Amino acid sequence: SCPVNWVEHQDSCYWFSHSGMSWAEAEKYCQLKNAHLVVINSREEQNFVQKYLGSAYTWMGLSDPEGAWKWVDGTDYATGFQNWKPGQPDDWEDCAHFHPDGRWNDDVCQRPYHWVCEAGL
Numbered sequence: 001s002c003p004v005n006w007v008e009h010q011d012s013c014y015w016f017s018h019s020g021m022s023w024a025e026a027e028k029y030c031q032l033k034n035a036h037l038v039v040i041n042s043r044e045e046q047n048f049v050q051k052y053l054g055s056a057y058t059w060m061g062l063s064d065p066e067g068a069w070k071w072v073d074g075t076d077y078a079t080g081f082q083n084w085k086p087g088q089p090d091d092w093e094d095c096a097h098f099h100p101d102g103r104w105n106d107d108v109c110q111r112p113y114h115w116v117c118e119a120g121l
């Protein structure tokens with residue numbers, strides 16, 4: 001089972017913020033909750049996470065520190081699930097966020113966007 005205010009799907013617990021923070025501060029917040037910024041491993045996981053998104057741009061655990069996209073937990077990016085908006089990312093420090101429709105885009109990591117934490121059960 002998951003902590004109160006988190007939602008369960010398969011082997012993960014998810015928490016959706018109601019306020020915004022820079023990408024790195026969001027990652028620190030999730031780490032302190034024994035979690036990480038969400039890593040989208042599959043279409044099924046994408047579909048679950050996206051229905052809880054609000055209208056705010058929302059960080060995921062994907063960033064481009066040295067001209068290579070990397071998931072925060074070391075999940076392989078190039079062979080992994082991707083759900084970019086068409087033509088995106090077009091400017092690749094850069095961090096990935098969800099649009100309200102669940103598709104991904106990039107912006108600078110300082111923006112105070114909402115975020116999602118993901119933890120084990």
Ligand SMILES: [Ca+2]
Pocket residue numbers: 012038039040041045118
């Ligand atoms: Ca995941």
